[PDB]
Design a protein around this ligand. Sequence first.
Ligand SMILES: *[C@@H]1O[C@H](CO)[C@@H](O[C@@H]2O[C@H](CO)[C@@H](O[C@@H]3O[C@H](CO)[C@@H](O)[C@H](O)[C@@H]3O)[C@H](O)[C@H]2NC(C)=O)[C@H](O)[C@H]1NC(C)=O
Ligand SMILES: *[C@@H]1O[C@H](CO)[C@@H](O[C@@H]2O[C@H](CO)[C@@H](O[C@@H]3O[C@H](CO)[C@@H](O)[C@H](O)[C@@H]3O)[C@H](O)[C@H]2NC(C)=O)[C@H](O)[C@H]1NC(C)=O
Ligand SMILES: *[C@@H]1O[C@H](CO)[C@@H](O[C@@H]2O[C@H](CO)[C@@H](O)[C@H](O)[C@H]2NC(C)=O)[C@H](O)[C@H]1NC(C)=O
Ligand code: NAG
Ligand code: NAG
Ligand code: NAG
Ligand code: NAG
Ligand code: NAG
Ligand code: NAG
Ligand code: NAG
Lengths: 575, 322, 61
Amino acid sequence: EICGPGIDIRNDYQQLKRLENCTVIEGYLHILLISKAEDYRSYRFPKLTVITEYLLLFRVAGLESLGDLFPNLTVIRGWKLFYNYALVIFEMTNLKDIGLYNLRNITRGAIRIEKNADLCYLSTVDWSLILDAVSNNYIVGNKPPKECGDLCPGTMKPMCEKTTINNEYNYRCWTTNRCQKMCPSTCGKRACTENNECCHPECLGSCSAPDNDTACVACRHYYYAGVCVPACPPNTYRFEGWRCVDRDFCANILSAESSDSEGFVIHDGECMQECPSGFIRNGSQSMYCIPCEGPCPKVCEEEKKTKTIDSVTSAQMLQGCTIFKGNLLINIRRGNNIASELENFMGLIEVVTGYVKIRHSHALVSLSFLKNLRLILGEEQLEGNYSFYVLDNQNLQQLWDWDHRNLTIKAGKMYFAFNPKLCVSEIYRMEEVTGTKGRQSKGDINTRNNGERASCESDVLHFTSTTTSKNRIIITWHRYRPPDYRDLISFTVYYKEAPFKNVTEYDGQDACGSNSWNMVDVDLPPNKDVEPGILLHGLKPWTQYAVYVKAVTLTMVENDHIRGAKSEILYIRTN
Amino acid sequence: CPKVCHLLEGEKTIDSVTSAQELRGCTVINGSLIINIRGGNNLAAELEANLGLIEEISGYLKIRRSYALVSLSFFRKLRLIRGETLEIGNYSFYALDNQNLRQLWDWSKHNLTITQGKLFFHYNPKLCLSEIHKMEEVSGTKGRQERNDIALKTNGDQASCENELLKFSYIRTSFDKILLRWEPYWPPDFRDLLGFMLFYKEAPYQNVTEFDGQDACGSNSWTVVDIDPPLRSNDPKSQNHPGWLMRGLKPWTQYAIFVKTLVTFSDERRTYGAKSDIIYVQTDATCSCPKTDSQILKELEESSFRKTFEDYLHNVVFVPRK
Amino acid sequence: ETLCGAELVDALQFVCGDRGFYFNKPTGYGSSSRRAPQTGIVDECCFRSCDLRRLEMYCAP
Ligand SMILES: *[C@@H]1O[C@H](CO)[C@@H](O[C@@H]2O[C@H](CO)[C@@H](O[C@@H]3O[C@H](CO)[C@@H](O)[C@H](O)[C@@H]3O)[C@H](O)[C@H]2NC(C)=O)[C@H](O)[C@H]1NC(C)=O
Ligand SMILES: *[C@@H]1O[C@H](CO)[C@@H](O[C@@H]2O[C@H](CO)[C@@H](O[C@@H]3O[C@H](CO)[C@@H](O)[C@H](O)[C@@H]3O)[C@H](O)[C@H]2NC(C)=O)[C@H](O)[C@H]1NC(C)=O
Ligand SMILES: *[C@@H]1O[C@H](CO)[C@@H](O[C@@H]2O[C@H](CO)[C@@H](O)[C@H](O)[C@H]2NC(C)=O)[C@H](O)[C@H]1NC(C)=O
Ligand SMILES: *[C@@H]1O[C@H](CO)[C@@H](O)[C@H](O)[C@H]1NC(C)=O
Ligand SMILES: *[C@@H]1O[C@H](CO)[C@@H](O)[C@H](O)[C@H]1NC(C)=O
Ligand SMILES: *[C@@H]1O[C@H](CO)[C@@H](O)[C@H](O)[C@H]1NC(C)=O
Ligand SMILES: *[C@@H]1O[C@H](CO)[C@@H](O)[C@H](O)[C@H]1NC(C)=O
Ligand SMILES: *[C@@H]1O[C@H](CO)[C@@H](O)[C@H](O)[C@H]1NC(C)=O
Ligand SMILES: *[C@@H]1O[C@H](CO)[C@@H](O)[C@H](O)[C@H]1NC(C)=O
Ligand SMILES: *[C@@H]1O[C@H](CO)[C@@H](O)[C@H](O)[C@H]1NC(C)=O
């Protein structure tokens, strides 16, 4: 049978009895907040084979190994995560093993495991074989592995299969009774049973007979009468992104948990809670919703005045949120492919009223994922009327493709700081795109931090001549040709020994330590005929020094429009 | 003694110790001074031996892009500024683009005076504002401080400015080690405390203070020691006073030591930790071991990652009934 | 006193005990109601000193 829409085991074991019959969990599954150990093994359910949304365990007691409870669970399609993960096992007091020997695939989301008491056998898993995008995992706050030994069948002739990952080749095994037996190479991506009998193409996890389409435990795309078809046939409709079910069923379900309207509604061959923006259930029907006649933006309210986005479920909440009428804050610490999911969740954001802050959004190197964001109303600003704030963000090599991207703020002045891989050139380009340059100050958009390590466009200064010595060099470079010679043109010669030509520019971080770009400032000579020169003395008769110069306008007022002149890095070997 | 220093053009830029020797002995200045010292070795001691005799300035002082310079203590005997020669806008003290600037001379021992020029503080991301106000007070002319003279941003905004004081509840000096036990400082979010950073170094003269010497990097002056967070428990009164044992100290020797909280930055580094005072204590008479300070940063983003999860969990798990 | 992390849950446990905690039962498929009629609870126990009164509001008799 199929449970749903979700199960929450809380404060009692007898509630586990809701898992006797139903083998599919058509929703999340929480198990948590119990204090007992006697009946730890009085319950177990060989029927469970598949989960869809995710799995969560917290403060659970008595349990020693999950495998004894779910001897047949194989797949987790991650239709909905918790924070950024499809499986969470947090602060468990007695879990000695993860079990789930038959767990053979995970579709979406990563795993997060930590604060557990006596849990090991997490590294022994070949997460790459069972989980794509293992990089987003978080498995560090658990018991050290050296303490238990994490052994498995093969203690006496290796029985558990063997694979290699991250330059380490060894066994792959969950338990001391069972191993992580992968499929052979003859079929690879395809599924397979024990004794290496590859299953049907569109199978997933495992099956009971090779090339069998109905003897399969799970389906890659969608279920139908148990027949694991990789495509929901017509006259049916997809549901929970994992089962192609009947039509009338979409009406028998209830939705008053969130919205007590006329059940769900059908669109794009799916029984959506409510079909996406720009559509209404004309006549209040669960089977059709034509496109709205007007703009019909799905407003997105605010539980708390500001909706801090630091997870993937926070974006799921904003899946169809096209016009977010609340203040917004980004605080993403990590994540690699999240940027693509945000193009499906947040890619439809067209207007963000209230302030828009970005603090430590390290995982975002380019804000282009907001492909539809065009107007930050900024009607409600932070201190200083900041309608666009960016503080202590990591690289963020780029914001958008200003060549085509249209961005325009209505009120409030922006702010940028500590973006080493973003040189203000793009910031000034944004200002020009928005016409807000007449609104900013000279301290807000600081060039001392934005672009510290950003090497981008700059003017050239051709070395006019050099003459080397056994221990010195007299080097004269060309005078700078700015639009205003009145500017306080002042050069700074950077230099350092370069035994190999794989040398780069100075990025501020190289102040102290070996291979630091040594710097020497010099003012342009008053004589307009003589060009700036320097005699340097830290040289070798045979060393290859990489050296160049950097010139800046240094306008009368602090940072009116600073256009930097960067010279090539020239390698010089004294006679 | 009175040894004036008559200069050409009234403004001698000094970007090198070679330029410091030019004024070695120049106590009273006939003009102003401009500093752009970005890198070099033996800055502290050489500047003390050369410019230590500086009794007063007749002009003004400008300090632009002085990176390798950490503190101004090398202007020991400086007490007065005539403000006759002054930067554009009546600025006796002008400072700009001073990254490693950590602290000014002192505001309990060194007295200062300013005649005509104003102050200026911008892009000093490691210098707190408390010292700025202390200067505003001692130097006088506090009414000369106008708007934009000191932007609260880019002024010690990066270097954590400890706001609260810590107390050593219990101490024990031996001949080779020293046991310490201080108050269990615990912010509202106890988990925001990643640990403590004890700093210590021999100091026979109590005239030592913070930021007395530091190159572009500060892995040379102080001796740092990390201490894992304490053990929290219910009944907050029950948690033992966190402590630590410092090892390897010469018998019968005075060391200067102080605690420094290792905390986490909130949305606006609201969790300003604490620190105690420089404590002098004389001992009893009888493969790259040092860790990378950069690791600290790595310990931050991960910690804030865990707390961002729990706070989310409880934000959706529990439910209040009617 | 303010409560955070594992200590908040330890106190909630000391409160409920054999009485058990109260959640929102999922009555129908799809999303659930507004995740909370207010902000998170830590906004009351971490940022503010929540007393036993607030702790009893989440329990189940
Ligand atoms: C566990 O099973 C899943 C079954 O899909 C394996 O696939 C990942 O699933 C996603 C979406 O279901 C696939 O993305 C789809 O691919 C198309 C064509 O490349 C692309 O346009 C979209 O990105 C679309 O979502 C993804 O390809 C698929 N992964 C692979 C390697 O094919 C998953 O790999 C299985 N886990 C393991 C550890 O093998
Ligand atoms: C996987 O292998 C099994 C082998 O058992 C294949 O079984 C065949 O399945 C069909 C329907 O799924 C059975 O038809 C049935 O017909 C019999 C009368 O012959 C009737 O009594 C049943 O109630 C049912 O309607 C067929 O008998 C069965 N054959 C055998 C030998 O079991 C199954 O089709 C394979 N899966 C695939 C091909 O996807
Ligand atoms: C799991 O299924 C079994 C049978 O399929 C259920 O047992 C039936 O429950 C009714 C309750 O009204 C009893 O009268 C029957 O005697 C039970 N069956 C048998 C064979 O005794 C059981 O209740 C189901 N479990 C759940 C949680 O629904
Ligand atoms: C801009 O800032 C000023 C002063 O900080 C204040 O009046 C308000 O925040 C903004 N001005 C408006 C909204 O007119
Ligand atoms: C929108 O962007 C295009 C391409 O960059 C540009 O030609 C056009 O002028 C822009 N219009 C507005 C209103 O920003
Ligand atoms: C160039 O590469 C070599 C290794 O082949 C390395 O030892 C050296 O440090 C590199 N030089 C620079 C400047 O990165
Ligand atoms: C300079 O070095 C080059 C390199 O071989 C040499 O040919 C030349 O004679 C040298 N001249 C002087 C003046 O050192
Ligand atoms: C320096 O001395 C000259 C006399 O040669 C005098 O005219 C000038 O005012 C003096 N400047 C200062 C700052 O003392
Ligand atoms: C100080 O301000 C007065 C008033 O305008 C001005 O005349 C004078 O030139 C200023 N001095 C400096 C050094 O800026
Ligand atoms: C302390 O006094 C000694 C002796 O005069 C001196 O060399 C040193 O620079 C002083 N340091 C401080 C910080 O006062």
